[PDB]
Write a protein that binds this ligand. Sequence first.
Ligand SMILES: [Mg+2]
Ligand SMILES: [Mg+2]
Ligand SMILES: [Mg+2]
Ligand SMILES: [Mg+2]
Lengths: 381, 381
Amino acid sequence: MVSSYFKGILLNLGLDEERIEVLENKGGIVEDEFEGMRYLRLKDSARSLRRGTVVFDEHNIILGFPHIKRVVQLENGIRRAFKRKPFYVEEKVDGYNVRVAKIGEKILVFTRGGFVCPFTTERIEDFITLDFFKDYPNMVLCGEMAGPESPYLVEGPPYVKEDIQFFLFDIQEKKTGRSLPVEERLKLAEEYGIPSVEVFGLYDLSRIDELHALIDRLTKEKREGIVMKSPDMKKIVGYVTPYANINDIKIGARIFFDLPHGYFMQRIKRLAFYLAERKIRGEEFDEYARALGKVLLEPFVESIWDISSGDDEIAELFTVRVKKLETAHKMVTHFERLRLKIHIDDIEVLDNGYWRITFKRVYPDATKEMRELWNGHAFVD
Amino acid sequence: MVSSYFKGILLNLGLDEERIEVLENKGGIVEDEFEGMRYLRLKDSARSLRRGTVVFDEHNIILGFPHIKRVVQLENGIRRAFKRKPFYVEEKVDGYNVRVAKIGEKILVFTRGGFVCPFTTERIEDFITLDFFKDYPNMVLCGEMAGPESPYLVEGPPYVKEDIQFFLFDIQEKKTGRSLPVEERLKLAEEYGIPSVEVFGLYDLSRIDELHALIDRLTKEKREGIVMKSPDMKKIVGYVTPYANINDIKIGARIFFDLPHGYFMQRIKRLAFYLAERKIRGEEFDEYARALGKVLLEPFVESIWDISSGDDEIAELFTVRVKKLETAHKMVTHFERLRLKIHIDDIEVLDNGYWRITFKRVYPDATKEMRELWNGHAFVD
Ligand SMILES: [Mg+2]
Ligand SMILES: [Mg+2]
Ligand SMILES: [Mg+2]
Ligand SMILES: [Mg+2]
């Protein structure tokens, strides 16, 4: 299942031989390959080695991201996490996270599960100077890839009007995964001109009313929310806008089936706690209730009508821009290896010489369940 | 864990000794007691022995109910289940199901999991002549207990204006669980004056438009739906109204947490498929969307405000009528044994000599989760 080359590295990191065998047999560790370079992916956590960790050799170990906790009640979430101590407040940007690292002579870009993204790996030179990795070869740039032409999302921040952008939110050490303190990370982003998430400033519990006002502005601006970080990066909590919760449901309800457990319920919960904390009542409350009902039902009913004839599969269209047509071929191979059903729908050359690729992503499992129910399949609750 | 008396009975029914041991160790079979009579309850299925089966001796075996499948698309659900053959259409009544049987010299009433209900056991003589069991001691009357003064629900059919009522929907053999054909069951209900679910008539696929019209009438009348049965009772499918799905969410959203998996999602799904099948559009669609958003959010936000001070637990009030105060004491003991937190809030003697008991049922686990989130606990998605 997994080479003794990689199991030897795990042994030297202190994993037990029995744990390695269980991980190997259960598919918790798997081998992958990018441009001929073999590496190990952690599909499950292995003690200190978080899910999404990748191992190329004894030194080139890129730790997966911790799961960052969210609060649904902002004022008490702050009181619990930070008491009255100060914390940085940054934008939560709605994209996909990436880790950028120098591996051998190559700059590689990893998505959350530890896959090398051929698209982002080709594009990352458009956003980050490679000087950073000449000076800090053992550091990992951590950021959100976000915009309207994304390979993995169909939404994004309003201020990215075309293509896609990188937004730094952390700088971590290889092997240990240790985060730089906020201030040092921000100094490095300045020094190397690395685009950053917006840092709104330094706040504390006493400024809760300014933070509510910020959330209200972000909601009207169709932005995702905030991430709250102690200066030493040891305490991190996120809080998202009602816009983010409502729009997530709208996008998801087109598919409905085969989504992460609790996808819709969690966002209904976050909406209810926002309405409760902000004391929203009267007509304003009614507009949220109407919006929630609309985004749950309208996209879902439309897909039912789509599938009800019997030909089509539920689908999402998206576009990306690539420098080389060869990258588009590599993404098709990459999607096929990820067990996604995605094909090229259109291609256009742009006036700057980039290729704009339109992909169509279809959802056969959600389609099957939706169609079986339409066709009268009977099931127990 | 479980007496050799009962394991001997299971052996004679053909269960394997190893299966019995696994069931015993896992708590899939447990012993219970009512008025000094010991019996075995099946918390898990055991081959042919469905969950909720109870065993008192070699003969007094009362089979649990099959899980009756539902369709979410009525016309195609009928086409799939029945093709163009006729089927009976009965009312689905929103209550709790019961099995009534003669055990020794006693008439006992069992709820779905196989518990003897002390309330319904005391009350059942108000609805069914015990003559039936003099003539058919080996038959089980199966019905819904429904009304505004219910120990287990806080909703019910509109035409039960006070107290609670029994509605027969099946007659089954002891030990085998075999259902009588519809016509024989209806003849017996007539002969013994047993109150029945409304039988709307005999229908087929060709009458789908009359069935949609029926569903529309039932929805406006705040009734639950229909159950479709082949005359031989071998094919049974249910279909519920949009009213039932919306009101279920409204009731459930007061608690929200600690409910059956998929409770809300399943009812959102049923609403979407009704809107799609009936081609509901425009203002009519908007009113369903507004209703769905309101029943998800309003009861939930109200409970958050309730718990936000820190004293109260989420609660439901209900009333029942009993002939004897002693029955009220037995229900408290019964609730305590079921791991419910329910106490007596009020008592009133009625002009007919019955006692009206007001109980308060509280939800400590849902309360705890709701309050932790309000108080700022941070969690991953
Ligand atoms: Mg995100
Ligand atoms: Mg989003
Ligand atoms: Mg029911
Ligand atoms: Mg109901």
